[PDB]
Design a protein around this nucleic acid. Sequence first.
RNA 1: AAAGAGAGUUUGAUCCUGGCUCAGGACGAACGCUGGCGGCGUGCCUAAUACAUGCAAGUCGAACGAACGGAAGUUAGUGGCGGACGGGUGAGUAACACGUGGGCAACCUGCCUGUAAGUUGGGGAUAACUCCGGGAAACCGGGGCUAAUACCGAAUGAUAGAGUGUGGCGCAUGCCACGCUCUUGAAAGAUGGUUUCGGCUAUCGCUUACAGAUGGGCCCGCGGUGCAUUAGCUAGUUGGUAGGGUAAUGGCCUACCAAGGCAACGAUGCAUAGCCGACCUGAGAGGGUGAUCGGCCACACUGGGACUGAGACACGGCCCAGACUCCUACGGGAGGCAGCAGUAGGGAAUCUUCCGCAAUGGACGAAAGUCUGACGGAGCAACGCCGCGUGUAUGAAGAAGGUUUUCGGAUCGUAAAGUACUGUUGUUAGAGAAGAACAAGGAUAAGAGUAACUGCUUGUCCCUUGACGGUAUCUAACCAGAAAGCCACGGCUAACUACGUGCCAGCAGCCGCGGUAAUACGUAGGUGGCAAGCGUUGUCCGGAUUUAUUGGGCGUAAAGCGCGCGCAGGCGGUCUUUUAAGUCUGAUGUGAAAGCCCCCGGCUUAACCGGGGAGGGUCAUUGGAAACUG
Lengths: 82, 88
Amino acid sequence: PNIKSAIKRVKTAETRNSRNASQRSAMRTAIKKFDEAAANNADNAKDLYVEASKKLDSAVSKGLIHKNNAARNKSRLAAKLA
Amino acid sequence: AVKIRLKRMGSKKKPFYRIVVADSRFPRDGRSIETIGTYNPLLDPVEVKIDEEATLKWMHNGAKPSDTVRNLLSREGIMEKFHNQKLG
RNA sequence: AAAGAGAGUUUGAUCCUGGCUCAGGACGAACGCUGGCGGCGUGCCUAAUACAUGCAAGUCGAACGAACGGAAGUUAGUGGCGGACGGGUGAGUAACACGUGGGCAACCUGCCUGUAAGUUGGGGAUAACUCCGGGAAACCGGGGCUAAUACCGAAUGAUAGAGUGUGGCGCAUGCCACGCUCUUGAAAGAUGGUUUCGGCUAUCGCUUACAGAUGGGCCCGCGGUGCAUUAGCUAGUUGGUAGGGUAAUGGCCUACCAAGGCAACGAUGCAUAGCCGACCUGAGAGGGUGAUCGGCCACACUGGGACUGAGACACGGCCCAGACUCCUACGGGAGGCAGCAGUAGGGAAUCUUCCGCAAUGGACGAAAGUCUGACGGAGCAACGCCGCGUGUAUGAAGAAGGUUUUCGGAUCGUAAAGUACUGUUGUUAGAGAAGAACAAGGAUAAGAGUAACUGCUUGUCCCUUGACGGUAUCUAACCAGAAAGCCACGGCUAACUACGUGCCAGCAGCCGCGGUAAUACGUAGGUGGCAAGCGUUGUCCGGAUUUAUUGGGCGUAAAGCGCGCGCAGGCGGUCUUUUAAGUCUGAUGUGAAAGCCCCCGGCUUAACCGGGGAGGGUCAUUGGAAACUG
Ligand SMILES: [Mg+2]
Ligand SMILES: [Mg+2]
Ligand SMILES: [Mg+2]
Ligand SMILES: [Mg+2]
Ligand SMILES: [Mg+2]
Ligand SMILES: [Mg+2]
Ligand SMILES: [Mg+2]
Ligand SMILES: [Mg+2]
Ligand SMILES: [Mg+2]
Ligand SMILES: [Mg+2]
Ligand SMILES: [Mg+2]
Ligand SMILES: [Mg+2]
Ligand SMILES: [Mg+2]
Ligand SMILES: [Mg+2]
Ligand SMILES: [Mg+2]
Ligand SMILES: [Mg+2]
Ligand SMILES: [Mg+2]
Ligand SMILES: [Mg+2]
Ligand SMILES: [Mg+2]
Ligand SMILES: [Mg+2]
Ligand SMILES: [Mg+2]
Ligand SMILES: [Mg+2]
Ligand SMILES: [Mg+2]
Ligand SMILES: [Mg+2]
Ligand SMILES: [Mg+2]
Ligand SMILES: [Mg+2]
Ligand SMILES: [Mg+2]
Ligand SMILES: [Mg+2]
Ligand SMILES: [Mg+2]
Ligand SMILES: [Mg+2]
Ligand SMILES: [Mg+2]
Ligand SMILES: [Mg+2]
Ligand SMILES: [Mg+2]
Ligand SMILES: [Mg+2]
Ligand SMILES: [Mg+2]
Ligand SMILES: [Mg+2]
Ligand SMILES: [Mg+2]
Ligand SMILES: [Mg+2]
Ligand SMILES: [Mg+2]
Ligand SMILES: [Mg+2]
Ligand SMILES: [Mg+2]
Ligand SMILES: [Mg+2]
Ligand SMILES: [Mg+2]
Ligand SMILES: [Mg+2]
Ligand SMILES: [Mg+2]
Ligand SMILES: [Mg+2]
Ligand SMILES: [Mg+2]
Ligand SMILES: [Mg+2]
Ligand SMILES: [Mg+2]
Ligand SMILES: [Mg+2]
Ligand SMILES: [Mg+2]
Ligand SMILES: [Mg+2]
Ligand SMILES: [Mg+2]
Ligand SMILES: [Mg+2]
Ligand SMILES: [Mg+2]
Ligand SMILES: [Mg+2]
Ligand SMILES: [Mg+2]
Ligand SMILES: [Mg+2]
Ligand SMILES: [Mg+2]
Ligand SMILES: [Mg+2]
Ligand SMILES: [Mg+2]
Ligand SMILES: [Mg+2]
Ligand SMILES: [Mg+2]
Ligand SMILES: [Mg+2]
Ligand SMILES: [Mg+2]
Ligand SMILES: [Mg+2]
Ligand SMILES: [Mg+2]
Ligand SMILES: [Mg+2]
Ligand SMILES: [Mg+2]
Ligand SMILES: [Mg+2]
Ligand SMILES: [Mg+2]
Ligand SMILES: [Mg+2]
Ligand SMILES: [Mg+2]
Ligand SMILES: [Mg+2]
Ligand SMILES: [Mg+2]
Ligand SMILES: [Mg+2]
Ligand SMILES: [Mg+2]
Ligand SMILES: [Mg+2]
Ligand SMILES: [Mg+2]
Ligand SMILES: [Mg+2]
Ligand SMILES: [Mg+2]
Ligand SMILES: [Mg+2]
Ligand SMILES: [Mg+2]
Ligand SMILES: [Mg+2]
Ligand SMILES: [Mg+2]
Ligand SMILES: [Mg+2]
Ligand SMILES: [Mg+2]
Ligand SMILES: [Mg+2]
Ligand SMILES: [Mg+2]
Ligand SMILES: [Mg+2]
């Protein structure tokens, strides 16, 4: 960049990129270990829904996901619970 | 943030302003929501014509007069009404 | 209400048909000769060619750790907001891109406004700073220390999710309201008044929820281009079932299943093009265009990708690849004027490397304030429109001198010269505007909120700010003095005589002129059209009824298929009842602003600028009529 205000933006965005990717992949793992548990019909299937719900709507407060996205995913996971 | 402001039109060194309601983002002489009145500064007694009804309607929806407009509306005397209808 | 001009040219002469040419208007124009001023506008149409050099995007110390000052008072980095606005261009694009009208019970929305709940308790860091290390340079690593409205858990809190009860409902999918059970999801302080210090409190903030406003996303009916010497096109293509993904519906994506979908009412393909309000012309219907101003779209050296964010696949942000320019110590690095000026090139052709944030509007800030090549102004160019100056009045049967003359005269010409007068413009010197509202700061008054303030909202006074610029504009004097050119004169078409040339030089839009008496070639005198201009060229409309709906034709002038049978399509005898698609009519919503038109008003008039109105649709909802077509 060559505007003084632009040098800061390129480097302050990488810090936001680093923090966002870290906790975004934390969300996907909780979902990853739920649908496989739902298929096996283990007893862990019920309580693995709770922290996955906790991870989803915590991301809304952090502001890296839309509230419709979090509301939608919780509903669709609940159907798989059986 | 929609706010009411002047709009410069006329000829070189002969300005004439038309009070309009528009967003801050849009150009000074571009898109606007609607027009309320005019303002002639060249007349030594400055003459202004205002709706006195669309202004009060707009200012209860999140519209803020600018620096010069507020003087116009106060001198004409409707910010008193904005005061009274707010508390009443 | 409005309401339409023709002429020349085929022939020995004529009447028709028929083409060609001319008289009118308009340019972002160019070129040629000439050239005084003022006002208002306009100025790379070609190479979306390549770019020297300056400036166009910052701000906040009232969110957190420094230097001047005897430790009072002012100035880097983390962090927040803004850079997605404002400004440029017209390459691509023949499609929901745009115009017009709808739908979203299928959607999102920072800042702004209102309302309701709160803003409680902890933790671990890391920039800056300080050493070491690497490299030419860009800049990269390692060790140690520190803060925050930076970051991460915790208590409490969902109309977020699941399971239900009720009602009221709608357009099929479904919607609105309330109740119950269970599970998840939040936060920050800063500047001041009071008290005491507990604490309370004002302002700006912070988190969640709901409304309004604003800005966007998706879908749909209709509308606006050439070629059939371009006949087939398509395979995630067409529909269905389950899932994924998105703010949201959807082959948007995936697996399975079936074979569908579009097209002579023109698919596909090639060529060309941003779209509109509007502009030019026209009696009108139409024809051509889409520069300036306004709305929407696409693009940012050429391709591809994503991150951050409420909003981008981002003009002055990042990553990779390519072409080009530059710096290298050969290891590697740095760039993007279709921002404002400016340079080279192309071209028949287009401007200053200017002054200011004083006004308006933007970003940040609590506020002074900072930034703003947006915007206000100034500079260059007869590029266009408008205004008026290059003098007025009286003055000879008539100055001189040109030019002609059957030599007497005629014409330039009342124009000279003379007398009298004026200063718009000029030169000199004096007076000197509006555009200014402000904000902030100081006193008050009244309110809501207060245990009380501080403070907040409204009202009145005091003070403060001009790039233009001593600009516009007045009054004082002197000067007729410094200020007129361009094209035509055979007909079309207003305006004719001499001399020179002799089918030569030459002229020309058409008819056509010139071969030793040319109103047509060249020059004079005179005249005619305009005038700071006037001519030529290029492009568009008109005249052109010469694509004829308004508004033409086919015996001999161009023009009836050699004739039949017939699918689609077009058109269709008489009466009654009904319907309401076509048809006519009322109401509501909308067709932005600017522009043409009508009525008023300001610039000493005009151009120009304001206020109001009108017009403009095979438009949407709804109510009527039943003659005509269906
Ligand atoms: Mg928590
Ligand atoms: Mg004034
Ligand atoms: Mg003849
Ligand atoms: Mg003819
Ligand atoms: Mg005419
Ligand atoms: Mg003409
Ligand atoms: Mg001159
Ligand atoms: Mg000249
Ligand atoms: Mg261009
Ligand atoms: Mg290019
Ligand atoms: Mg440079
Ligand atoms: Mg500057
Ligand atoms: Mg401080
Ligand atoms: Mg603050
Ligand atoms: Mg600083
Ligand atoms: Mg823009
Ligand atoms: Mg284009
Ligand atoms: Mg354009
Ligand atoms: Mg629309
Ligand atoms: Mg620590
Ligand atoms: Mg370190
Ligand atoms: Mg460390
Ligand atoms: Mg809770
Ligand atoms: Mg909680
Ligand atoms: Mg907020
Ligand atoms: Mg927009
Ligand atoms: Mg869609
Ligand atoms: Mg279409
Ligand atoms: Mg589905
Ligand atoms: Mg598809
Ligand atoms: Mg096609
Ligand atoms: Mg005509
Ligand atoms: Mg027309
Ligand atoms: Mg241009
Ligand atoms: Mg270029
Ligand atoms: Mg994001
Ligand atoms: Mg890109
Ligand atoms: Mg940018
Ligand atoms: Mg874009
Ligand atoms: Mg931009
Ligand atoms: Mg640039
Ligand atoms: Mg490069
Ligand atoms: Mg430029
Ligand atoms: Mg040049
Ligand atoms: Mg050249
Ligand atoms: Mg300013
Ligand atoms: Mg300002
Ligand atoms: Mg503010
Ligand atoms: Mg600057
Ligand atoms: Mg400047
Ligand atoms: Mg300007
Ligand atoms: Mg001029
Ligand atoms: Mg010229
Ligand atoms: Mg003589
Ligand atoms: Mg004589
Ligand atoms: Mg004078
Ligand atoms: Mg003077
Ligand atoms: Mg003076
Ligand atoms: Mg002001
Ligand atoms: Mg004040
Ligand atoms: Mg007071
Ligand atoms: Mg008081
Ligand atoms: Mg006050
Ligand atoms: Mg003076
Ligand atoms: Mg005077
Ligand atoms: Mg005199
Ligand atoms: Mg004649
Ligand atoms: Mg002769
Ligand atoms: Mg002639
Ligand atoms: Mg001649
Ligand atoms: Mg002559
Ligand atoms: Mg003459
Ligand atoms: Mg004139
Ligand atoms: Mg001309
Ligand atoms: Mg021409
Ligand atoms: Mg015609
Ligand atoms: Mg005919
Ligand atoms: Mg016939
Ligand atoms: Mg014959
Ligand atoms: Mg014949
Ligand atoms: Mg026959
Ligand atoms: Mg039939
Ligand atoms: Mg019939
Ligand atoms: Mg029929
Ligand atoms: Mg209009
Ligand atoms: Mg008048
Ligand atoms: Mg006007
Ligand atoms: Mg008007
Ligand atoms: Mg009937
Ligand atoms: Mg009936």
